Amino acid sequence: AKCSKGRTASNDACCVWFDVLDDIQENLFDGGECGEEVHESLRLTFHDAIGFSPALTRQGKFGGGGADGSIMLFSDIETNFAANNGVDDIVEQQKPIAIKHQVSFGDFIQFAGAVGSSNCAGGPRIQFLAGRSNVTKPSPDHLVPEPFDSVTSILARMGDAGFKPDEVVALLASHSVAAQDTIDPKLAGHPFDSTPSDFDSQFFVETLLKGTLIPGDSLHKGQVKSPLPGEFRLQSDELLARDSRTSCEWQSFISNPNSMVPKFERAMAKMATLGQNPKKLIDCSEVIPVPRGRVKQPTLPAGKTIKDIEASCRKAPFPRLPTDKGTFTSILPVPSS
Ligand code: HEM
Ligand SMILES: [Ca+2]
Ligand SMILES: [Ca+2]
């Protein structure tokens, strides 16, 4: 079928997504940038989708509808869940965009995440399926993992939703393009790695460094010491990098950086369709832009050495990496407005 601006798609019902693409790229994402709005949009895909629990369903309780737009339609309820702190900003920005284009909240949330991530240097090109219904119910509370949850708790929660430990690690490649706002509000915008617009392996490297710094006046719930000026570290990321259930796969994205994009893409296709049947949706994947940027060689930060890495994979040593020359420059906070 013929879409706008000389574009085409096998399925006429994908054509609307080209118009949503143009709008969110030019406006929400300020000209195709991998900045704040993209980071928030990518986080939102998880906070919508993870509200899904077969365990609750089998005990005769509502388990959540997964990737169903519930966090948006029922934003009054869901954004007041503790685990959903700092989410309403992006939800209230996206809501009128989805309404104006008359696309479903669930589809829009996943679309904004897929388009957004494709703008990041070396980013993924996530599968995009359309057709999720708005008719659903608010997610139960306590289904979103928290940064102070144990690795046992996180893996069990993610396992219930459908993800193996390796897949949890893959999904956390998202933290390569990511900052915090609510754990330590005064340090809003301090990112989880040195390259928050580059979909690279620096997150996996830098979380394995020894925690040495309290960046603000104190530590806060869900935070641990960071290894570099300007960086923020989550307690969960630190535990996951070191825990024997996950440490080898954590290190695998450093030993084999080319695997990060394909494994993230596969895990995200799954997460974006929680509570849905793909065979009853339509495939509009071709609307997602092709990402640009080569796979980067992960490097140790300036002034750090291999002694600063807390290597945690029993079966295989940490890979030999180059070390950046000179002294370390504080990592810039992510802009936002
Ligand atoms: C597995 C357990 C996870 C935990 C405990 C966790 C925890 C967190 C926390 C505490 C923040 C900072 C929130 C704030 O204070 O502003 C954050 C940010 C973020 N999360 Fe995760 N997360 C998890 C998994 C994921 C997944 C699966 C995704 C998506 C694939 C994701 C995407 C993001 C992104 C893109 C940000 C940055 C948001 C921004 O820049 O404002 N996270 N996460
Ligand atoms: Ca949901
Ligand atoms: Ca990065």
Numbering used by the authors: 2 to 338
What does the paper say about this structure?
The heterologous expression of the POD genes from the P. ostreatus genome, and subsequent kinetic studies, reveal a peroxidase array consisting of three VPs and six MnPs. The VP1 and MnP4 crystal structures were solved as representative for the two POD families present in the P. ostreatus genome. The overall structure of VP1 and MnP4 showed a heme group dividing the protein into a distal largely helical domain (formed by four main helices and two to three small ones) with one structural calcium ion, and a proximal domain composed by another six helices and a non-ordered region stabilized by a second calcium ion. The site where this takes place is conserved and comprises three acidic residues (E36/E40/D175 in VP1 and E36/E40/D181 in MnP4) located near the heme propionate occupying the most internal position with respect to the main access channel.
Concerning short MnP, whose crystal structure is now solved for the first time (from P. ostreatus MnP4), its main structural difference from P. chrysosporium long MnP concerns the existence of a more exposed Mn oxidation site, due to the absence of the C-terminal extension that in P. chrysosporium MnP (with a total of 357 residues) is partially fixed by a fifth disulfide bridge. The oxidation of lignin-related substrates was not detected in MnP4, where the active tryptophan is substituted by an alanine (left). The ability to oxidize Mn2+ completely disappeared after the simple E36A, E40A, or D179A mutations in MnP4, and also after the double E35A/E39A mutation in VP1 (the simple E35A, E39A, and D175A VP1 variants lost over 99.8% of their catalytic efficiency but retained detectable activity on Mn2+). At this site, the P56 to G59 loop of VP1 presents a six-residue insertion in MnP4 forming a small extra helix that protrudes into the solvent. Also, residues A130 and V131 in this VP1 region adopted a different conformation with respect to V135 and T136 in MnP4. These changes allow the F62 hydrophobic side chain of MnP4 to interact with K137 and, due to this interaction, the hydroxyl group of T136 interacts with one of the waters coordinating the distal calcium ion. Most of them involve the change of small hydrophobic side chains in VP1 for large hydrophilic side chains, such as the substitution of G290 in VP1 by K296 in MnP4. This lysine has interactions with D198 and D200, which are directly involved in the coordination of the proximal calcium. When the MnP4 crystal structure was solved, a striking observation was the high number of solvent-exposed lysines (a total of 20) and other basic residues (up to a total of 34). Another noteworthy characteristic of MnP4 is the high number of surface-exposed lysines (up to a total of 20) and other alkaline residues (up to a total of 35) compared with the other P. ostreatus PODs, which would result in a higher net positive charge of the protein and increased stability at acidic pH.
